[PDB]
Design a protein around this ligand. Structure first.
Ligand code: TI3
Ligand code: CA
Ligand code: CA
Ligand code: CA
Ligand code: CA
Ligand code: ZN
Length: 316
């Protein structure tokens, strides 16, 4: 929509108040003109046709409960954009400031969110398993990272390359959560998962097994469910990423942590320079080692830690 840039105010899924960038032209739209070619948030109106209608509001105030998921999808997409630009010098998911589009209120009681190849889509959850998915900053960043992966490595969504695709989104979803410093942790989806149960989450990067996911290559899922276990085997890579950053002793292998920032630098470089559509775990290890080498030299502690972490999870 062509109009005047302004700032509205609303309340997100968790009841928090935040300012959002909108555009005025008769109505106030969830169109952020301050980031690249824009961030656009749509109303899917409980249907499955996408993208739906660009979110229109009469007074630039978004405090209705129906508004909450829109406020968060719009706001968190902005934070994620800032992270990539500020931290990795990447302009939007395609690196050329492509417009970011998200649709909320997708279907009825839909317990998931996804990147459909063109935009992000968020369900409202059934109120038991999930509340509106856009309320979790790690969820939004995870989805947008799927876009980044699509335009870079292009990791195929099945088997090992798919598990890497998933891990990359969890890793960067987590790094964005720390970047926004929103009660950061190494868990995935804790803010929108099971409103009636405290302390749980969808996945854990620090301890994948906590939720039944493998934390070692010898325990990888070899079946066909979940596209060959893309959301299951990602636990092995998530654990490796956690070790590289924080350090620790896993299955008797000791890893000196090098911190979150370097973890982000190493994985972003691996993703954008070395990974290919069919890369497997072993190739990921090689890509990560090469990235750390480029960045810190072959005799660096950073290189040593990446090696130890992959050794720890049994990926040679
Ligand atoms: O992990 C994801 N989605 C969940 C998902 O797609 N799956 C698992 C899941 C767990 C819990 C509830 C729903 C879904 C199971 C296998 C697979 C699936 O449903 O196909 C990613 S792709 C999106 C997401 C991230 C964080 C929080 C919520 C959603
Ligand atoms: Ca309003
Ligand atoms: Ca958190
Ligand atoms: Ca989290
Ligand atoms: Ca919960
Ligand atoms: Zn995903």
């Amino acid at each position: 929509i062509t109009g005047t840039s302004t700032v509205g105010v609303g309340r997100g899924v968790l009841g928090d108040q935040k300012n959002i960038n909108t555009t005025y032209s008769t109505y106030y739209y969830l169109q952020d003109n301050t980031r690249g070619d824009g961030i656009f948030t749509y109303d899917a109106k409980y249907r499955t046709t996408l993208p739906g209608s660009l979110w229109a509001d009469a007074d630039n105030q978004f405090f209705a409960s129906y508004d909450a998921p829109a406020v968060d999808a719009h706001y968190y997409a902005g934070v994620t954009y800032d992270y990539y630009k500020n931290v990795h010098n990447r302009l939007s998911y395609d690196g050329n400031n492509a417009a970011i589009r998200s649709s909320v209120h997708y279907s009825q009681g839909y317990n998931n969110a996804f990147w459909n190849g063109s935009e992000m889509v968020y369900g409202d959850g059934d109120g038991q398993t999930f509340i509106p998915l856009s309320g979790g900053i790690d969820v939004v960043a995870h989805e947008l990272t799927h876009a980044v992966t699509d335009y870079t490595a292009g990791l195929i969504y099945q088997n090992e390359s798919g598990a890497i695709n998933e891990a990359i989104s969890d890793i960067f979803g987590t790094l964005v959560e720390f970047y926004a410093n929103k009660n950061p942790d190494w868990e995935i989806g804790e803010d929108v998962y099971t409103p009636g149960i405290s302390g749980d989450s969808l996945r854990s990067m620090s301890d994948p097994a906590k939720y039944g996911d493998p934390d070692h290559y010898s325990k990888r899922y070899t079946g066909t469910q979940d596209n060959g276990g893309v959301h299951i085997n990602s636990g092995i890579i998530n654990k490796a990423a956690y070790l590289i950053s924080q350090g620790g002793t896993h299955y008797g292998v000791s890893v000196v942590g090098i911190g979150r920032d370097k973890l982000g630098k190493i994985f972003y470089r691996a993703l954008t320079q070395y990974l290919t559509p069919t890369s497997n775990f072993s190739q990921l290890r090689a890509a990560a080692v090469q990235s750390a080498t480029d960045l810190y030299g072959s005799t660096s502690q950073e290189v040593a830690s990446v090696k130890q972490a992959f050794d720890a999870v049994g990926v040679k």
